[PDB]
Amino acid sequence: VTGSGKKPWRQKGTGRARSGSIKSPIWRSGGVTFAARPQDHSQKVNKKMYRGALKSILSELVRQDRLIVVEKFSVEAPKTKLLAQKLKDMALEDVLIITGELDENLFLAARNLHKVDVRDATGIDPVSLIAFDKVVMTADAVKQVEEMLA
Amino acid sequence: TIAKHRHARSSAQKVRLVADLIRGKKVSQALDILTYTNKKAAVLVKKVLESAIANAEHNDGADIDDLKVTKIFVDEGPSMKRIMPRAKGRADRILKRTSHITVVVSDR
């Protein structure tokens, strides 16, 4: 706290308290007593614990039927209203579309949709497997993720 | 009909000394008493007991001989502050009191 270490006044003498600095951590414009530094927050969770968490999240979606399975789902033009109206007449609300392999048109068909994410096969995570209400799963990706989870 | 005077430069005791004797009187006597009291709060209160009768005859259409003072109260204004030079080092700032004087004259 920019100043200098000089006292305000000498210690004994005039009838006040024993002041110590112009950077005094109980003063106005003083310091902070336990100020914290630029830090990190990532913890570490195991390979076994992470895959056990994935096997735990892959069960209540079955017991509650928020996971549904579809073989083919795509479009043949980079246009987002086609997926919008496809989900409209398919009558779903909040979908996590996980493809099996690379797709460019359907990945170009989420950049204005809010309750839609065109997820890849591998890149799933056990908080976006609860944050989305309903979810599909393709048979190009079922074995691609079960070879991971073993 | 009421009248105010705010930031009148006197203190909230030496203005209340004049206006504890024109609370319950008639406004014929409550001008001659404020002439014939020798303070400065007599002037600071007679000017607004003048410019309340001269604003209840204009913006109310009331008379003069019908009136009677029913309530008069003072509030305490805010003060500027300047320093007085003490000796053997010290200094002292002094608070210079200002007043809000209010007159409330009614009819019946």
Binding site: - | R82, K88, G89, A91
Partner: peptide, 28 residues
């Protein structure tokens, strides 16, 4: 004319209460 009525309130950065030399108890 117009007003501007906030000027100064300084403690002048000067000294304080004094001391004593009126010797107290001391004997024997």
């Amino acid at each position: 004319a117009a007003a501007a009525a906030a000027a100064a309130a300084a403690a002048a950065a000067a000294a304080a209460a004094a001391a004593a030399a009126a010797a107290a108890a001391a004997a024997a």
